[PDB]
């Protein structure tokens, strides 16, 4: 199923969690106390790291960023990884940015378990 449905997934997941009113320590985020890396997908093929960091600083400082562009033509592949300073910031970003429309392209945001350093 095409990825915008995979944004629908995470947003439904959040709202269901609030719907059952479940406590934060057992909130689905809790399984990643061990990661400051969050995946961005669906970025337009134009955004560079300047704009990405600028916008996503809104919840903290960024330790690292890796934007996978195709090396042969250098051009952005439209998805990236982001290492925030403190897990809580990534929780906030996953909550708030999952589904924002940038240049028409609705970007999807998520946790990352085992970020691979390339």
């Amino acid at each position: 199923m095409n990825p915008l449905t995979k944004v629908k997934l995470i947003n439904e997941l959040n709202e269901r969690e609030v719907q059952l009113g479940v406590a934060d320590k057992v909130s689905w985020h809790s399984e990643y106390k061990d990661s400051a890396w969050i995946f961005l997908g669906g970025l337009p093929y134009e955004l560079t790291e300047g704009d990405i960091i600028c916008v996503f600083s809104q919840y903290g400082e960024i330790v690292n960023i890796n934007l996978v562009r195709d090396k042969k033509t250098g051009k952005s592949k439209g998805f990236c990884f982001l290492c925030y300073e403190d897990q809580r910031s990534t929780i906030l970003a996953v909550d708030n940015f999952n589904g924002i429309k940038i240049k028409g392209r609705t970007i999807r945001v998520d946790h990352v378990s085992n970020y691979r350093a390339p």
Binding site: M1, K6, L9, E12, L13, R16, E17, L20, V26, S27, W28, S30, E31, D110, V112, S113, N114
Partner: protein, 355 residues
């Protein structure tokens, strides 16, 4: 608005306009007490042929197009459209495409009863208007640009094929799937076949060979979306035609097993769903070899984060590693640890199906 002003019926010399006036009893149907509803509904059922299609639909369909339709109002209007459809039998032939253009959304909607209604009435309309009418009318939607209508068409087609029996409609399909103008046509053809299998199920066995012939030509095509959707088709077929029919699929296996090693991302997910369903249809020896092969790839993907990746591997594990012809400790050692580490997470629970 007409009902606001008043004028005498004789002065309403356009006796068809008289008909329209009295037809705006529709409002009584829409809003009104239960007795108003019942009396109006009888009125219209029995004066149906007296009224005739043209007026009826020309004054119904605008309603159904209303943005401000609530639920009751809608199901009421579909009730009527159904009853008048049962009276006017042929007279609808000019009005089919209109009827679909409005009903189609009921096919894709989160209400359950709305889906079942819309589906049933398209069946009835397909039975009423003759096949050739349906075909000729809703062909041009196959190619239509906006995917919304392509998708909803494919679903409708599957319904009508259930109504009028596959072997009738099969040649039209064969044409569509091997269309050459643009590939969206082919994609929608293959989608039709998927939805048939999903809907009718085991009523398919006597045609399984013909279907698979229709659809496999997309298994190898260089376009990417057609390959994925084709694999999903094959998987739907199999899950319907459980244990049987494997001699008909035999032609298609190798391309599956070819693509499975060397695909990445999406195509991998699809081809995995297909081979998953195929395995039980196989015979314990052929299948045991095939199995122990696939479980290699399978292992590799438990840790993938992509959602449908996870879901597909769930269902597959169920089938392959739930087969009669496998062994305890193999599973116990190589499958169980990663399975329970990865899949038992609170994010799963909060989802509905994954549960």
């Amino acid at each position: 608005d007409k009902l606001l002003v008043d004028v005498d019926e004789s002065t309403l010399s356009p006796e068809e306009q008289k008909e329209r006036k009295i037809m705006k009893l529709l409002l009584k149907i829409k809003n009104g007490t239960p007795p108003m509803r019942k009396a109006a509904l009888r009125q219209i059922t029995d004066k149906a042929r007296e009224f005739g299609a043209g007026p009826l639909f020309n004054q119904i369909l605008p309603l159904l197009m209303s943005p401000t339709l609530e639920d009751q109002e809608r199901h009421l209007l579909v009730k009527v459209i159904d009853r008048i459809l049962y009276k006017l039998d042929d007279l609808v032939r000019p009005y089919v495409h209109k009827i679909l253009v409005v009903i189609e959304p009921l096919l894709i909607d989160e209400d359950y009863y709305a889906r079942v209604e819309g589906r049933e009435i398209i069946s009835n309309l397909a039975k009423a208007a003759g096949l050739a009418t349906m075909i000729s009318t809703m062909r041009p939607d196959i190619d239509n640009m906006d995917e919304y209508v392509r998708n909803t068409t494919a679903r409708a087609f599957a319904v009508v094929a259930s109504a009028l029996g596959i072997p009738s409609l099969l040649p039209f399909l064969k044409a569509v799937c091997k269309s050459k103008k643009s590939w969206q046509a082919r994609h929608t053809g293959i989608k039709i076949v998927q939805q048939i299998a999903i809907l009718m199920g085991c009523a398919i066995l006597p045609h399984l060979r013909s279907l698979v012939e229709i659809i496999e030509h997309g298994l190898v095509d260089e376009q990417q979306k057609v390959r994925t959707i084709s694999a999903l088709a094959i998987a739907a077929l199999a899950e319907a035609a459980t244990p049987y029919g494997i001699e008909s699929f035999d032609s298609v296996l190798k391309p599956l097993w070819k693509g499975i090693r060397q695909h990445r991302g999406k195509g991998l997910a699809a081809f995995l769903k297909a081979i998953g369903y195929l395995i039980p249809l196989m015979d314990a020896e052929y299948a045991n070899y095939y199995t122990r092969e696939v479980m290699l790839i399978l292992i590799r993907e438990f840790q993938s984060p992509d959602e449908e990746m996870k879901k597909i591997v769930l269902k597959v594990v169920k089938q392959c590693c739930g087969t009669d012809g496998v062994e305890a400790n193999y599973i116990k050692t190589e499958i169980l640890p990663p399975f329970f580490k990865h899949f038992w997470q609170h994010r799963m629970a909060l989802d509905r199906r994954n549960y």
